[PDB]
Design a protein around this nucleic acid. Sequence first.
DNA 1: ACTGGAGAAAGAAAGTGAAAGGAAGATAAAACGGGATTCATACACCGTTAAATACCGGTTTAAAAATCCCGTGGCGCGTTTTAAAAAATCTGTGCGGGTGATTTTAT
Length: 68
Amino acid sequence: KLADCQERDPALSELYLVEGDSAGGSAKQGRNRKNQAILPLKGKILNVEKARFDKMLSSQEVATLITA
DNA sequence: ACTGGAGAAAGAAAGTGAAAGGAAGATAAAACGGGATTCATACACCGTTAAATACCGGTTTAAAAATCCCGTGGCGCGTTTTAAAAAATCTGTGCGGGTGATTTTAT
């Protein structure tokens, strides 16, 4: 789901987080593809304050964010 | 000749799809054990009598009970271990409005 940029210098790159695919589609068409990236999420995210470490690890959105 | 960037080769480390097999499950056929009938047949209850046994009086005697000395092991005390049961603390889950997403078929 990641739409990456073309710059290879991390000090000149940006990342945007959006709520879902409907917002991501609109964001990808108006961005500057040279040094901007878009990563869509899915709904409300897990509350890590009330959860456990294994429960956090078993999540999918958190894993995708960590990988990104 | 020399320098530094860039592309291509070559080599080594990590991820991968496929692998007997075995303990761990699961599912049927079989052997079992516990009720409803059906009587014939052996068992329960009632008069009669010869016989076997219980009981009394007095011995006795051999065996068991009572008594004394002693020397030990089997209970008793104090202090540790160790499972077992109980109290305390975590883990899921569903109720109803909200946010955002997935898949298979025909022509």
